[PDB]
Paper text:
PPARs belong to the nuclear receptor superfamily and the ligand-activated transcription factors; they exist in three subtypes in mammals (namely, PPARα, PPARβ/δ, and PPARγ) with considerable amino acid identity (54–71% in humans). The ligand-bound activated forms of PPARs are stabilized by associations with specific coactivators, thereby enabling the regulation of specific gene expression. The carboxylic groups of the PPAR ligands are known to stabilize the AF-2 helix 12 through hydrogen bonds (red dotted lines) and electrostatic interactions (blue dotted lines) with the four surrounding consensus amino acids: Ser280/Tyr314/His440/Tyr464 in PPARα-LBD, Thr253/His287/His413/Tyr437 in PPARδ-LBD, and Ser289/His323/His449/Tyr473 in PPARγ-LBD. When compared to the LBPs of other nuclear receptors that have 600–1100 Å3 cavities, the LBPs of PPARα/δ/γ have relatively large (1300–1440 Å3) cavities that are able to accept 1–4 ligand molecules.
After some trial and error using various cocrystallization techniques that we applied for PPARα-LBD and its numerous ligands, including conventional cocrystallization with multiple buffer sets, cross-seeding, soaking, coactivator addition, and delipidation in order to remove endogenous fatty acids, the PPARα-LBD–lanifibranor cocrystals were obtained by soaking the PPARα-LBD–clofibric acid–SRC1 cocrystals in a buffer containing lanifibranor. The structures of lanifibranor bound to PPARα/δ/γ-LBD were solved in a monoclinic space group P21 at a 2.98 Å resolution, a monoclinic space group P21 at a 2.46 Å resolution, and an orthorhombic space group P212121 at a 2.29 Å resolution. Obtained structures were identical to previously reported active conformations that form the Activation Function-2 (AF-2) helix 12, thereby providing root mean square distances of 0.60 Å (226 common Cα positions in PPARα/δ) and 0.53 Å (212 common Cα positions in PPARα/γ). Lanifibranor was found to locate in the same position of the Center region in PPARα/δ/γ-LBD, although its benzothiazole moiety in PPARδ was flipped sideways when compared to that in PPARα/γ. A previous cocrystallization study located lanifibranor in the “Center” (for its benzothiazole ring), the “Arm II” (for its 5-chloroindole moiety), and the “Arm III” (for its carboxylic moiety) regions (yellow in Figure 4K); however, in this study, no electron density was observed in the “Arm III” region. Our structure seems more reasonable because the interaction of the carboxylic groups of lanifibranor with the four consensus amino acids contributes to the stabilization of the AF-2 helix 12 so as to facilitate the recruitment of coactivators in all PPAR subtypes. The “so-called” PPAR pan agonist lanifibranor indeed activated all PPAR subtypes with EC50 values of 398 nM (for δ) < 572 nM (for γ) < 4.66 µM (for α), and equivalent efficacies (13.3% of the maximal responses for α/δ and 24.9% for γ).
Numbering used by the authors:
A (entry chain A): 200 to 255, 266 to 468
B (entry chain B): 687 to 696
């Protein structure tokens, strides 16, 4: 197609332009090769403090705000990535906020699985690597935050998607027509179908062997929505039980009356 | 809210 094949590469560009790191880079850092200098691994409090002294309260709470700084940076990138979507800037100023209110984290987790593996994930622009077992070590409720994401990322990574696939997937996550409070539920739905259409045609052409990759990703979308709901629940517990853990203004604004 | 919309207006 003309537009369908073109719009797919436009969203791809906005992905690469606004999103670093991506998956192609995360796969380079991992699996060795073309690198030779592996990232500093963080598997205990010792390695954690070494990585902290080189960056400028409890350990669990410090790791907290470190992930908040990344969530905030990602949401910003998402806002820029969203504006480059055909039709997002044309929507109502309030409908743009809602699409990003329920979609940001649902996308953050999708993209997060690119820098993850059964053993850990890459942090600090790929220069570091934090092991999964170390996170399960921390005290509750912190030890339960990242664990569900690893599980999703494992089954998600099984689908063997690349940045072109993921880009369209993320865009679809943002152009969700059944978000609570959506005004023009009719215009967004049309925009959503256009995005979902290209995604479907793109997968049928980029993975001709996996003929059901499209419905699987749909399943994953439902999984991510559930995965955000539970995450938002665990965030409230941390906001109300941990006295030294303060949410970021931008982050507190998004969870405000979410689920 | 106040942020986000402060961003969308860019």
């Amino acid at each position: 197609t003309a537009d369908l094949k073109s719009l797919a590469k436009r969203i791809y560009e906005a992905y690469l332009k606004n999103f670093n790191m991506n998956k192609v880079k995360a796969r380079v850092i991992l699996s060795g090769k073309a690198s030779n200098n592996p990232p500093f691994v963080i598997h205990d409090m010792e390695t954690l403090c070494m990585a902290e002294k080189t960056l400028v309260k409890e350990a669990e709470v410090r790791i907290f705000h470190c992930c908040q700084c990344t969530s905030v940076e990602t949401v910003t990138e998402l806002t820029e990535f969203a504006k480059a979507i055909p039709g997002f800037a044309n929507l109502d100023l309030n409908d743009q906020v809602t699409l990003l209110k329920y979609g940001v984290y649902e996308a953050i987790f999708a993209m997060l699985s690119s820098v993850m593996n059964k053993d850990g994930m890459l942090v600090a622009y790929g220069n570091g690597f934090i092991t999964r077992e170390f996170l399960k070590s921390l005290r509750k409720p912190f030890c339960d935050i990242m664990e569900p994401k690893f599980d999703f990322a494992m089954k998600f990574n099984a689908l063997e998607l690349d940045d072109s696939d993921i880009s369209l997937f993320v865009a679809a996550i943002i152009c969700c027509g059944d978000r609570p409070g959506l005004l023009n539920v009719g215009h967004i739905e049309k925009m959503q179908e256009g995005i979902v259409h290209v995604l479907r045609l793109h997968l049928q052409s980029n993975h001709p062997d996996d003929i059901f990759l499209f419905p699987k990703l749909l399943q994953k979308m439902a999984d991510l929505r559930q995965l955000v709901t539970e995450h938002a629940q665990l965030v409230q517990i941390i906001k109300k039980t941990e006295s030294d853990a303060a949410l970021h203004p931008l982050l507190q604004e998004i969870y405000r009356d979410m689920y | 809210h106040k942020i986000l919309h402060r961003l969308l207006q860019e």
